[PDB]
Amino acid sequence: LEPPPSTFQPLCHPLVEEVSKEVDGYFLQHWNFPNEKARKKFVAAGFSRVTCLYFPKALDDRIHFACRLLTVLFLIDDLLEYMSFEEGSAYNEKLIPISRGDVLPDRSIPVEYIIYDLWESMRAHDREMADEILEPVFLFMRAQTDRTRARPMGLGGYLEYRERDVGKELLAALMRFSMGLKLSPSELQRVREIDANCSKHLSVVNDIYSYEKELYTSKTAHSEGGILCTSVQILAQEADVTAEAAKRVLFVMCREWELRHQLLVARLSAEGLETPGLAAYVEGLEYQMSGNELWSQTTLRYSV
Amino acid sequence: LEPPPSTFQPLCHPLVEEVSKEVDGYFLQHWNFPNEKARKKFVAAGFSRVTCLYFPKALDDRIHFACRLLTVLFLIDDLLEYMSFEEGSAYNEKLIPISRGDVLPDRSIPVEYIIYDLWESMRAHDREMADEILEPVFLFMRAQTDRTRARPMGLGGYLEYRERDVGKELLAALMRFSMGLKLSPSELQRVREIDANCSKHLSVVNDIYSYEKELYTSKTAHSEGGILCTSVQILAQEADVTAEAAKRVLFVMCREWELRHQLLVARLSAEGLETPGLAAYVEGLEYQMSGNELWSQTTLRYSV
Numbered sequence: 001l002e003p004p005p006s007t008f009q010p011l012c013h014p015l016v017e018e019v020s021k022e023v024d025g026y027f028l029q030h031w032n033f034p035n036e037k038a039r040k041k042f043v044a045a046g047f048s049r050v051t052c053l054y055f056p057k058a059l060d061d062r063i064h065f066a067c068r069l070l071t072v073l074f075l076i077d078d079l080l081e082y083m084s085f086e087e088g089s090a091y092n093e094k095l096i097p098i099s100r101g102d103v104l105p106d107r108s109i110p111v112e113y114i115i116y117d118l119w120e121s122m123r124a125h126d127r128e129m130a131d132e133i134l135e136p137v138f139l140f141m142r143a144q145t146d147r148t149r150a151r152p153m154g155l156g157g158y159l160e161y162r163e164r165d166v167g168k169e170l171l172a173a174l175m176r177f178s179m180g181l182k183l184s185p186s187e188l189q190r191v192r193e194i195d196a197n198c199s200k201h202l203s204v205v206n207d208i209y210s211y212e213k214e215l216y217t218s219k220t221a222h223s224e225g226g227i228l229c230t231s232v233q234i235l236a237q238e239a240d241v242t243a244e245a246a247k248r249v250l251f252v253m254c255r256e257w258e259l260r261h262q263l264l265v266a267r268l269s270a271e272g273l274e275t276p277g278l279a280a281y282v283e284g285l286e287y288q289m290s291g292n293e294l295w296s297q298t299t300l301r302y303s304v
Numbered sequence: 305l306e307p308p309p310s311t312f313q314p315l316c317h318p319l320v321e322e323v324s325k326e327v328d329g330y331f332l333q334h335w336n337f338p339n340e341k342a343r344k345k346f347v348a349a350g351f352s353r354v355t356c357l358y359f360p361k362a363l364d365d366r367i368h369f370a371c372r373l374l375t376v377l378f379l380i381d382d383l384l385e386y387m388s389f390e391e392g393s394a395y396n397e398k399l400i401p402i403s404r405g406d407v408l409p410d411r412s413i414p415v416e417y418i419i420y421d422l423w424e425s426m427r428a429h430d431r432e433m434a435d436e437i438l439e440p441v442f443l444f445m446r447a448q449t450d451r452t453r454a455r456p457m458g459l460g461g462y463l464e465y466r467e468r469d470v471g472k473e474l475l476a477a478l479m480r481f482s483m484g485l486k487l488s489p490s491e492l493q494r495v496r497e498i499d500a501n502c503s504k505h506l507s508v509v510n511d512i513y514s515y516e517k518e519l520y521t522s523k524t525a526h527s528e529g530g531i532l533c534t535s536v537q538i539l540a541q542e543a544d545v546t547a548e549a550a551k552r553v554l555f556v557m558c559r560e561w562e563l564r565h566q567l568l569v570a571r572l573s574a575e576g577l578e579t580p581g582l583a584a585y586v587e588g589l590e591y592q593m594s595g596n597e598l599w600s601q602t603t604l605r606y607s608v
């Protein structure tokens with residue numbers, strides 16, 4: 001698979017190695033891994049590396065929070081593949097009041113106290129910015145087990161849904177939190193079109209590289225939890241071509257979204273609407289897109 | 305618009321210059337043009353040139369029939385843009401019994417006697433093969449005013465419909481007639497996957513180059529007859545990109561359809577199923593795809 005040229009250059013957080021050891025070490029200590037093979041596969045994925053590629057300009061004392069949140073969501077994402085839609089929904093909904101801090105965790109259940117302690121530590125560091133990540137996370141969690149995954153979709157309908165399932169909103173709120181980048185409601189309304197365009201890029205790039213993994217999962221895991229819901233399959237069905245053909249076409253489309261991003265940002269600046277905060281924000285989104293692609297094309301999570 | 309690499313070599317019928325002069329001259333004499341500007345535009349389109357690119361291995365004494373048929377259908381196709389679905393249907397339905405030769409033409413009405421004399425001349429040359437073009441033509445004509453054009457369509461649904469509106473079947477029967485290429489029902493049923501794949505290529509290549517023409521038509525012509533119905537607009541809406549971006553992505557998809565064509569052809573002969581007639585047929589379909597692209601790139605019908 002040869003990716004067409006891109007002008008987006010990825011950047012990684014300088015503290016990636018020490019934060020990786022810290023976060024991986026925490027989960028290896030607390031998370032209920034079934035066996036040693038799973039523990040090695042967990043480390044091999046590099047969940048803190050993708051986080052550091054996603055938010056390379058996060059504050060040095062906040063990047064670990066982002067690594068912890070994405071890591072635990074990665075782990076849960078894999079667990080849901082062996083559950084039904086109903087079981088996955090019950091699993092996630094249990095964690096939601098716990099994430100809010102409204103409900104105390106069962107200390108004998110790792111996922112509950114990991115989730116609880118995480119959000120408590122994040123609110124302790126920055127209460128206002130931490131709270132603004134909550135609902136975007138819950139929107140993503142509920143999209144994971146939405147029964148729309150088992151119903152016919154076109155490319156457009158998928159991308160609209162996948163924006164929630166890919167967690168575009170939580171990644172944006174997490175990025176702002178990790179950078180301490182505060183934007184007014186008016187400023188955020190200005191970049192909504194830019195956010196929507198960025199979401200499609202993150203979604204499809206993931207779909208492309210994670211297709212083989214998800215193909216295998218669809219055949220081996222739960223028929224609902226592991227259902228093959230991806231742009232690769234959808235375009236392949238609409239055009240009646242192979243998944244490999246669909247990947248090549250989708251990758252060209254991703255470059256068109258990169259072009260649109262630059263066009264939208266350029267217009268924002270020309271209209272005199274790009275505040276210093278917005279300028280940092282849109283650059284952060286580009287890091288997400290380039291960082292997502294670098295990690296996806298190199299991580300062992302997708303190659304083995 | 306830089307076309308992606310293709311391995312197809314477009315061929316043109318050697319008698320293109322003589323037949324173009326003959327057929328253009330016929331329509332300039334008989335067809336009712338609004339003004340001199342329209343007569344220039346008609347010649348500028350080169351309707352016999354695309355026919356010779358579509359069927360480069362047509363028999364020397366049969367190529368002119370195909371040129372006449374496609375030319376009159378091109379002219380009718382433009383006329384229907386200023387009619388409603390109801391009016392357009394009425395226009396086409398009147399030509400159907402005339403095409404069969406069941407009803408005499410009004411010789412004061414050019415379109416009626418041109419259609420009548422043409423089909424009569426075609427049946428006089430080869431009655432059996434001429435008759436086999438009838439139903440594929442009527443199928444195309446009735447697709448032109450299908451009410452589904454006024455309903456939102458996905459990419460898959462469009463391509464399924466467009467196979468009739470693009471006149472895939474009529475082009476196939478016309479090609480066989482022009483080459484005197486007879487196929488058995490078994491041979492015809494055998495290559496239906498190849499036909500469906502070829503149809504998508506013809507359709508999208510046309511959509512790509514005729515988009516600007518049809519965008520303008522949608523703004524100026526009848527609200528029904530001029531309605532914008534194309535894969536370019538569909539992909540642009542679903543992926544939320546410009547029409548130009550959608551063109552570039554669709555063009556890559558066309559090349560994937562070219563790859564599938566070669567794959568399906570190779571599989572036909574890998575299985576014990578490629579007859580001499582089928583080999584000439586599927587090769588003829590390649591000429592249609594490459595010829596349609598070559599003409600669409602250069603014709604003034606699309607560039608102005």
Ligand SMILES: C=C(C)[C@H]1CC[C@@]2(C)CCC[C@@H](C)[N@H+]2C1
Nearest residue numbers: 070073074077140166167202206
């Ligand atoms: C596009 C990405 C990085 C996805 C990967 C899978 C995962 C479940 C990882 C944790 C975050 C959620 C939104 N989601 C992001």
Ligand SMILES: C=C(C)[C@H]1CC[C@@]2(C)CCC[C@@H](C)[N@H+]2C1
Nearest residue numbers: 374377378381444470471506510
């Ligand atoms: C893709 C082509 C060549 C179309 C162009 C428009 C037209 C009405 C021209 C005459 C033949 C019909 C099928 N149809 C073919």
Ligand SMILES: [Mg+2]
Nearest residue numbers: 077078144165
């Ligand atoms: Mg998931």
Ligand SMILES: [Mg+2]
Nearest residue numbers: 077078081214
């Ligand atoms: Mg997953």
Ligand SMILES: [Mg+2]
Nearest residue numbers: 206207210214
């Ligand atoms: Mg994936």
Ligand SMILES: [Mg+2]
Nearest residue numbers: 381382448469
């Ligand atoms: Mg038409």
Ligand SMILES: [Mg+2]
Nearest residue numbers: 381382514518
């Ligand atoms: Mg037309």
Ligand SMILES: [Mg+2]
Nearest residue numbers: 510511514518
């Ligand atoms: Mg067209």
